[PDB]
Amino acid sequence: VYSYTEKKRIRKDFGKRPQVLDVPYLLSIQLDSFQKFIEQDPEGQYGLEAAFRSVFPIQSYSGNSELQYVSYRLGEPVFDVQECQIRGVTYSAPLRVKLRLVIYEREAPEGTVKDIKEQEVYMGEIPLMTDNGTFVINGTERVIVSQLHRSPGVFFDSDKGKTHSSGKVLYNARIIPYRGSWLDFEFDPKDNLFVRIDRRRKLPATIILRALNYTTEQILDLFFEKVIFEIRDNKLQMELVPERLRGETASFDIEANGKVYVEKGRRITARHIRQLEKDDVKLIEVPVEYIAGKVVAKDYIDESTGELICAANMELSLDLLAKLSQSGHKRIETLFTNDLDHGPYISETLRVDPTNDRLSALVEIYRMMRPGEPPTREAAESLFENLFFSEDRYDLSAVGRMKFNRSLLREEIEGSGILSKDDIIDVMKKLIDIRNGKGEVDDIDHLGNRRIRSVGEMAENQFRVGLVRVERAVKERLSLGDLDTLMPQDMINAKPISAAVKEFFGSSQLSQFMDQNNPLSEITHKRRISALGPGGLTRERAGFEVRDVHPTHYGRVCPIETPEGPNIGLINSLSVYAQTNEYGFLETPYRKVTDGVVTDEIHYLSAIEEGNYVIAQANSNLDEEGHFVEDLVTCRSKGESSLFSRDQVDYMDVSTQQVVSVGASLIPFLEHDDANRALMGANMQRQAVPTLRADKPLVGTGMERAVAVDSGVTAVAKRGGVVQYVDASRIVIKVNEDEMYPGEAGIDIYNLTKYTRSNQNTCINQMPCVSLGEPVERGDVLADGPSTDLGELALGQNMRVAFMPWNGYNFEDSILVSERVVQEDRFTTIHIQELACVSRDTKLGPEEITADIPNVGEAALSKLDESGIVYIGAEVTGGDILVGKVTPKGETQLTPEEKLLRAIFGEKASDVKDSSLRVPNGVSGTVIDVQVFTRDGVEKDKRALEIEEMQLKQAKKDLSEELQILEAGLFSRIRAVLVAGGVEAEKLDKLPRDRWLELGLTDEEKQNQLEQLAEQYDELKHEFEKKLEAKRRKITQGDDLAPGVLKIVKVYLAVKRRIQPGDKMAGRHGNKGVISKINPIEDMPYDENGTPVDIVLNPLGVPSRMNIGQILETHLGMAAKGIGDKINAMLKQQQEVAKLREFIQRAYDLGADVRQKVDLSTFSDEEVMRLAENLRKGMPIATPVFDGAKEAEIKELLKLGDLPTSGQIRLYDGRTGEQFERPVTVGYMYMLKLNHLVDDKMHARSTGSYSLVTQQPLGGKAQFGGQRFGEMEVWALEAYGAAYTLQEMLTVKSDDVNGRTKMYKNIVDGNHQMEPGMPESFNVLLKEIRSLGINIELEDE
Amino acid sequence: SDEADEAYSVTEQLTMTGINRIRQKINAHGIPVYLCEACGNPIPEARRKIFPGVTLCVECQAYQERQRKHYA
Amino acid sequence: INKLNRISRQMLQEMGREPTPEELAERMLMPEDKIRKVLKIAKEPISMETPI
Ligand SMILES: [Zn+2]
DSSP: OOOSSGGGSOOEEOOOSOOOSOOOOTTHHHHHHHHHHSSOOSSSSSSHHHHHHHHOSEEOSSSSEEEEOOOEEEOOOSSOHHHHHHHOOOOOOBEEEEEEEEEEOSSOSSOOEEEEEEEEEOOOBOOOOOTTSOEESSSSEEEOOEEEEOOSEEEEEOOOSSTTSSOOOOOEEEEEOSBSOOEEEEEOTTOOEEEEESSSOOEETHHHHHHTTOOHHHHHHHSOOEEEEEOOSSSOEEEOOGGGGSSOBOOSOEEETTEEEEOTTSBOOHHHHHHHHHHTOOEEOOOSTTGGGOEEOSOEEOTTTOOEEEOSSEEOOHHHHHHHHTTTOOEEEEEOOOSSSSOOOHHHHHHHOOOOSHHHHHHHHHHHHSSSSOOOHHHHHHHHHHHHSOTTTOBOOHHHHHHHHHTTTOSOSSOOSSOOHHHHHHHHHHHHHHHHSSSOOOOTTOGGGOEEOOHHHHHHHHHHHHHHHHHHHHHHHHHTOOSSSSOTTTSOOHHHHHHHHHHHHHSSSSSEEOOOSSHHHHHHHSSOEESOSBTBOOTTTSOHHHHSOOGGGTTTSOSSOOOOSTTSSTTOOOOSSOEEOSSSSEEEEEEEEOSSBEEEEEEEEOSTTSTTSOEEOSSOOBOSSSBBSSSEEEEESSSOEEEEETTTOOEEOSOTTTTSOTTTTSSTTGGGSOHHHHHHHHHHHTTBOOOSSOOOOSSOOSHHHHHHHHSSSSEEOSSOEEEEEOOSSEEEEEEOSSSSOSSOOOOEEEEOOOSOBOTTSOBOOOEEOSOSSOEEOTTOEEEEOTTEETTEEOOSEEEEEEEOOTTTTSSSSOBEEOTHHHHTTSSOEEEOOEEEEOOBEETTEEOBOOSOOTTOOSSTTSSBOTTSBBOTTOOOOTTOEEEOOEEEOOOOOOOSTHHHHHHHHOOOOOSEEEOOEEOOBTBOOOEEEEEEEEBTTSOOOHHHHHHHHHHHHHHHHHHHHHHHHHHHHHHHHHHHHHHSSSOOSTTTTSSOSSTTTTOOOOTTHHHHHHHHHHHHHHHHHHHHHHHHHHHHHHHHSOBOOSTTBOEEEEEEEOEEEOOOTTOEEEOSSSOEEEBOOOOOTTTSOEETTSOBOSEEOOGGGTTTTTOTHHHHHHHHHHHHHHHHHHHHHHHHTTOOHHHHHHHHHHHHHOSSOOSOOOOGGGSOHHHHHHHHHHHTTOOOEEOOGGGOOOHHHHHHHHHHTTSOTTSEEOEEOTTTOOBOSSOEEEEEEEEOOBSOOHHHHOOOOSSOOBOSSSOOBOOOTTSOSOOOOOSHHHHHHHHSSOOHHHHHHTTTTTTOTTHHHHHHHHHHTTOOOOOOOOOHHHHHHHHHHHHTTOOOOOOOO | OOHHHHHHHHHHHHHHHHHHHHHHHOOOSOOOOOSOSSSOOOOOHHHHHHSSSOOSOHHHHHHHHHHHHTOO | OHHHHHHHHHHHHHSSSOOOHHHHHHHSOSOSSHHHHHHHHSOOOOOTTOOO
16 A cells, blocks of 8 residues: 555565554754744743743832833844855844833832833844754754753762772762752761751751751651660560571571571571561560660650750760669660661761751851851851742753652652651652662663753743843843833843844854765754753763763664763764653653553653663564463563563563664664764764765665655655656646635646755755656655655665685775776765955955956956856866956055166066965866855945846846636635526636636625635735835845855856765665775776676674674665566566566565565556566565665565575686686675765865964864874984984974975975074974063073 | 774673672682671571682671672 | 944834844934944944853
């Protein structure tokens, strides 16, 4: 059940699993986040409404001067997108707010209002989001990478080991809020427990308990369990709770009933506790020595005196037992301490507690928060209440409360805003229990502690900071507040908020240039998480902790796609099915499980909600109904993974792909690659430059179509219909009768984007693929972009590789590319460089853009027209002129004998200095397009007038073609008027269309309908008169250029770089390479049938770097081209549709269980010929990533062709014509072309420009300056005895500004001497030391 | 050499040293002990027969392992 | 300079989008070119050790 578009070539699809969650729209992060940002949102939640409800209303100094909020608006831009890339504006959208300045009357708190002046005030231009989540800030398409930062809540950290040298670990616990004072708990190595408010001094941690209305009795009964001792007529009985005695010294005879069930000295093993439980002991009679070290909880005083016998939390010695014996107590309370489990911590910290009771504790808090402030009753009350208990001065965000209740094993995920007695006490219990053995510590990386921002929330915060810095000014201008003379816009300033928001979108560690050199690059750049930036941890502070992968990445961030090198792991790329949760933490799909069934309901899980479940594994064969095939299946429960019984799973992975990203899920046979290698593979697939004829992955992974379509490059049909008029520019879809709106149907039209620059200087082209008179279904591609083909992402080209050494040309990783790959121009990649030539305004005068140039005859000026700009199309080369420009330079200041010379030949020395924009030395191109911006203070020249006329012709053509469709829709609606009630069918197609307004009709509601539709027609008329007026006026106006520039002339060269020894190349699995000798055809190897193997890689790179996936891909490719050549023979020897059907059907079934059966008996006889003609280059093959095609499937798919099952053909060398012993592997591997081109990298500099502060080399153009002869190189030269080369390496070649010119004079005059002198850098050092008062001089002898 | 080759060497180093630590722990050589090195209880047959020459009863082992779980 | 800044804040919301020298040359009654030169001159110099 396929469409008519999908049948262009139906990708053979292995992969055994059924997909149950189709791939989400890959750009959900950017789009949905910026959608939450900018929208009138009738609820106080996120969006701009959040910021405005936060900072407004502004009340003055209580003076009945208020400025409140009403509602805002997003006026449409003045320049739309492509206009805004041409000209250079920020694709903004002017903001508007309805602020409402109210002024209450004095002698009135809320008495009668005296003025409510309601006026709408401008502020800022928020740069809107394109349809592809890519803003346009200054002409270039920029992208704001999602950030990943610590969620405000609670954290229990270790800081294990190194401190204190005893090895003993500390267990600190931090309560970070959204906004307010922190709170920390920590152990000392002496094991007492201490607190600290915001990172200030430590404190005896019981002081905060006491400050919260806790005296020692209830402290000890919160942080401890009770053991009562009894004095029942003889010597110190004890309560026996049976499980109190696991792992403890038996320092006494544990008898019972006068029977000995446990004996002294031993240890109470589980046997003993078992037997005491079975033998029912409850009150054991132990000696006094065992109470001698116990601790007494409650307070005891002589009941006859009221004098304090034992304070709370004192150790009972024998004397105190005696003393309270004579007071009439048979109950005694003792803390159940223990070295293992119920440790003494709060008790011994009370030992450390200097203070005694509540008021003293509040005093100490007041003296630790701020010194010098004398303590006080109410000062202490206010300070302590306002640390953690002030709704104004402290608020966990609701995210804060949610983490704080999920990390305590609480109940409600949402609740209060400030802390409480119970929140603090639960923190402390959790802390002590962490240290007691039960419980564990949340390591940093755990994605339950990495809330994900994105464009929306970050821009919201920047607008927030803007609002605070402006409400300062608002309250200030309200200080002087005249009641009714300042409207609600002189209080504000617009440029503040615009400054903040532009600073974010244009200067950030996030808002960065789109890696727009390959559709996979954009859609793997917009899906991106970053841990750097403002508010995240940067490298120095942190640090190795967050580089790591952590088992909560399984389906939430890709593990095998992260930028290797300087910052690994800080650029985690988001998974395939991942999402941002409601609160923010990354979440992912999982299929629900009933009693024992695998439901098809996908259910989302965040990070903190997972471990309490037990998730199955997607690689589980299930039994045609939703029951597993076994009773025990692999699963993963809490980090660990293991076998579980069938009746225990709760969640199955949505699909085998979800562990990866869109980066590494395109690598076919990813499953057989060492993870570093898939890392480098994805990170070299993000850089493939779009070739000239982008072919297709001959072996793909299923996700490639979704990446091509969901990225913006393909030209996706908005509505299904017939194709009326294709063309290299535009595609005209005639919408069908059912997908067609009721009024003014019309037809959809797509203006493609022909040749044009992207940021990385490549060609972002679009070519139609659906030809004239041809159906298209909704949601289908019309026009392939760069590196797409038929809507299947084709980054590089497939080609014939043969693994074999072949004379050292591929030594380390080098590659040997036969000239059949470069003759065809199949890696010939097109690069569209932009050269600008401004025309500035110096003190001497304005630069000219004349065609009149000195010291260059007609020679270099043959390509220039009458005005100094080159023609569109002249094939400039290295060193020619594109824009003739001359600057007036007075004071020629003639010299000696040069003056004699001018006398000798009378040649008038000109007043003008040539500065024309000449092509960079080396490129060789075609000037595809010249644009001339002009300050509107200059008379536009002749060529700019040509350009204005031409663009205006174009825009007139376009907008008139638009008006035609529109009026056709309105005539349609007119017929829809007549069709009901008195339509005259054939009396309306004969006569002219324009004379339908005067068509007869009875004066019912339908005559008034005709009148109304005539009104609509004339409105459209005047509308497009005035709209073409506005188009002509946008074109005709001057530009608004930088300060002091007359006119800029942009010239778009279009180089075509082919391929040449040095151009890096690479497969997908991470086999790099540097194509190293572009061999003839004859020389290459050739299999017994004749075909020369185009590339020749190296065998020594498959075992050493375990990326055997490239050998399996090579074999699947060889089988694929086997099928291809079989269809080619069946089609060239032209057979029929019948043989083709039987053979393609044999290819598409092919054995093992698959989810792809197509049944070509429904393809019409003429579709299968088209299907063949698209397969005649070779049958594509899918292979979902961790669910690929196992080897034996490949072997049978080879045997379906006629290749040898071994995969290894016997090759004959091309030069000697004699068989390679030991057959080689040959196949069709898909190889990219990385854009580390050679001619971008090559560089050489003999005498260029120079610096200005130190006479060193400095060039610009391609760092047109010498290589850095750094320090380690100087160590090298000193290691050799060579010292002359060093002396000239930093005296003659580099700095000594007489040494270098004398060296050049000597070199030209054929005397290789050198006259060093002394470096100008050291002379600067003498001056910089001497400006300080340090007289450094050089002795002279 | 490449940047993944060096990472392979480091991964070999890391897992080899970890595994060889944990094989250094387990004894596999008899020194028949017959009752604890701390508590004195008899070590049962099954435990002394799995791990030959193990000085400590089961409970003493769990207890020392738990005091060491907080890393000394 | 301070006149241009006051009138530029005021024009930035009076006209809505942002001002042009042709228009400051008629709000301010200056000769339409002193505005250009003033706007070229009135800016600070970049700290030459700025980090790129
Ligand atoms: Zn023991």
